[PDB]
Design a protein around this motif. Structure first.
Motif: not given
Ligand SMILES: [Mg+2]
Ligand SMILES: [Mg+2]
Lengths: 349, 349
Positions: A238-240, A265, A268, A271-273, A275, A280, B12, B19, B189-191, B193-194, B197, B238
């Motif tokens: 979670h943390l950034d 998953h 997966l 890991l896909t995130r 990059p 940043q 990635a 995926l 979504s994972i996204d 997180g950005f 942040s 978190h």
């Protein structure tokens, strides 16, 4: 202050008060460390079975060492004093025999980023591994996740990063000793949540002119650089800011991949995130130290299918691993030495 | 772009590519929903056994309703068409019998904050509970945690908060339908997180003049206020901006307390930190809506000892809960109606 929200404060007051009910629980932590059972006893034949040693190397070293002072460890069984060599005994023998320590072959601090979705347990494993003692490893575990690693013990890493301390203070005040003498830990806390939250702001106020993503490297890694062979960074998913500091200060990404088709998953997607996360750093003008990655398996339909899948994504950066004590302990040991060999593989090559 | 860090990009690329190996897994999600088995069949005697109903209420309603149009559900077993009433059948009967719906007794949206350290499953439970159908509940689950709730399905909540959408768009474009017709979900979504942040920053750029902690209330809750009886907020531990938005927009804190003496302390530490979290709202000049809290138990030494401990901290805000289908399903049901009754208890009283 209002009504029942003024009551959350009430539950809190009582929660912290029952947290004092905790001394009764600290003795429970040892119930978990009693299972580790680490004060391995070594019979001279076993030691002679170890790498680069032999019944004659052991005896010459023992005699020689014994003579100039050194006192080896012994046990009084029945009425006879057998030799029970300790990890330090075996380590010193290799030094007497002049076998080079890991710190004699590799320039100080190799930093590893462990992907969380276990670490100290791995650090302990690498340190006390039979065929690894000859390296006399010095490992530190940095906790940048508000929870787990701090479990192994008898000022958080987040605080130390802001306090901008010097090596002497870090050595003697922040870095704490684990149950295994070769592994040290810099603990985390719930309270790191507030710091992680107001990072850039706090950075600008306490660490003027310092880049917000080079602070892990700057204020800790670099100041404890000649003190550790390996440095593991533990962070949440979670943390950034804290997660970005780890990615900019690490050399190798270590990704443990779960067998459950459910978790496989998650990893997966994670890991896909990465990059985007590196970008940043790039945007802040900081070069990530990342130069190598490793991924393995753990732990029936999912498992057997996941392992064959990980090969597809990790390619050449994949590994192996896991009736219970004999068999498993062994399987675990094999994994550890596997991880070590891979690091050695990706390093001085 | 460098060397093996230029290789994380490689893993990635292959991860996202596997995926796509996922359509083979979407059919696995149904393997988890096939266990829910929800298309309950109701025999007229069962319905007659329900609250505020009787063999004579059912028959009068069925006859009456049948007459002005309504077509009830039936099954063709053997050669006879038995009545198999659906949740809507039973719900409409209560409406025909003019029993007031929950939306007729309580002013729109009661917001609940669920403490994460399961939610949609609870929402589904409350909706389809036998003695709860008479309420015809409309429940929405907001996902402000980069993971779990989105599991129940066939634009994230974070995005919608920033997009500043109107009720018509939220209704017809962001809010998605769950497997159970009465419960809706706004996914994560994972996204996120950005976004979590760079919250304040993004807020200041896209939502000028809006308070950074009233955005959950402002842009979603308030715009879907007449549409739902209960609104559950799901967030990570978190997170803080997203976690603070939940604490400022909720009426009741729902804290599930784990039996393991290990987890029981995590929760205790968490609860011990909420006050400081409310103060951050107070500092931003925002009043938290919190007005009630509830805590329960789940799931041998720990469990039995934890339950008796929770009473100490939660005081009067504690509850009960959990061979497997008969016994457990029942135990679960009892818990659900317990949770409902507590909400009713702390509400209009
Ligand atoms: Mg730089
Ligand atoms: Mg306000």
């Amino acid at each position: 202050m209002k009504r029942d929200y003024g009551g959350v404060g009430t539950i809190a007051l009582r929660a912290s008060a029952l947290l004092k009910a905790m001394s009764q629980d600290i003795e429970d932590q040892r119930k978990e460390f009693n299972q580790t059972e680490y004060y391995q006893t070594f019979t001279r034949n076993a030691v002679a079975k170890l790498p680069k040693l032999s019944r004659r190397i052991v005896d010459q070293a023992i005699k020689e060492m014994e003579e100039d002072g050194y006192q080896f460890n012994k046990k009084q069984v029945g009425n006879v004093e057998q030799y029970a060599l300790t990890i330090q005994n075996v380590i010193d023998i290799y030094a007497h025999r002049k076998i080079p320590k890991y710190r004699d072959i590799h320039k100080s601090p190799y930093v590893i980023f462990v992907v969380n979705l276990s670490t100290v347990t791995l650090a302990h494993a690498l340190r006390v591994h039979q065929d690894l003692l000859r390296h006399d490893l010095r490992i530190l575990v940095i906790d940048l996740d508000p929870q787990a690693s701090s479990t192994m013990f008898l000022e958080t890493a987040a605080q130390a990063m802001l306090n901008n301390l010097d090596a002497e203070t870090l050595r003697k005040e922040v870095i704490r000793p684990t149950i295994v003498p070769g592994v040290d830990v810099i603990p985390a806390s719930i309270d790191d949540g507030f710091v992680a939250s107001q990072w850039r702001e706090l950075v600008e106020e306490h660490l003027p002119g310092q880049n917000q993503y080079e602070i892990l490297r700057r204020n800790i890694i670099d100041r404890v650089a000649d003190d550790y062979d390996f440095i593991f960074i533990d962070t949440g998913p979670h943390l950034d800011p804290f997660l970005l500091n780890g990615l900019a200060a690490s050399d190798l990404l270590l990704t443990p991949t779960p067998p459950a088709q459910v978790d496989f998953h998650s990893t997966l997607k994670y890991l896909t995130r990465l990059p985007e996360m590196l970008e940043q750093l790039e945007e802040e003008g900081v070069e990530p130290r990342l130069s190598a990655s490793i991924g393995f398996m753990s732990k029936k339909r999912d498992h057997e299918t996941s392992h064959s899948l990980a090969r597809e994504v990790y390619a050449s950066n994949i590994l192996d691993s896991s009736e219970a004590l004999k068999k498993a302990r062994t399987e675990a040991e094999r994994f550890t030495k596997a991880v070590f060999d891979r690091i050695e593989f990706v390093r001085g090559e």
